[PDB]
Unconditional design. Structure first.
Lengths: 45, 53
């Protein structure tokens, strides 16, 4: 069964590999959003 | 109170928000002048109404 768990670990890896991309996406969004927050406050002031 | 303050907070310099007071004043002055000139037209018409009798 030692040859079986390899797929499992590589699977967890493959899964997380995109979760990181999600993190990047959300980060980029957060940047893009707060950049707007600045403007909103910049108008509000 | 602090919870709502942090929830409705924006990431931006504070000295820029207070500055908006200048813009707001520049936008209020117009309406204030319009009220001046309307209460003035009113006053004038009133004095004419007291001149004719």
């Amino acid at each position: 069964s030692n040859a079986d768990l390899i797929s499992y670990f590589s699977k967890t890896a493959d899964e997380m590999e995109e979760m990181m991309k999600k993190f990047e996406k959300t980060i980029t969004e957060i940047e893009a959003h707060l950049t707007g927050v600045e403007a909103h406050a910049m108008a509000m002031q | 109170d602090v919870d709502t303050y942090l929830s409705n907070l924006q990431t931006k310099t504070t000295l820029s928000m207070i500055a908006d007071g200048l813009e707001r004043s520049a936008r209020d002055f117009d309406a204030f002048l319009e009220e001046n000139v309307t209460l003035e037209w009113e006053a004038q018409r009133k004095r004419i109404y007291q001149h004719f009798g």
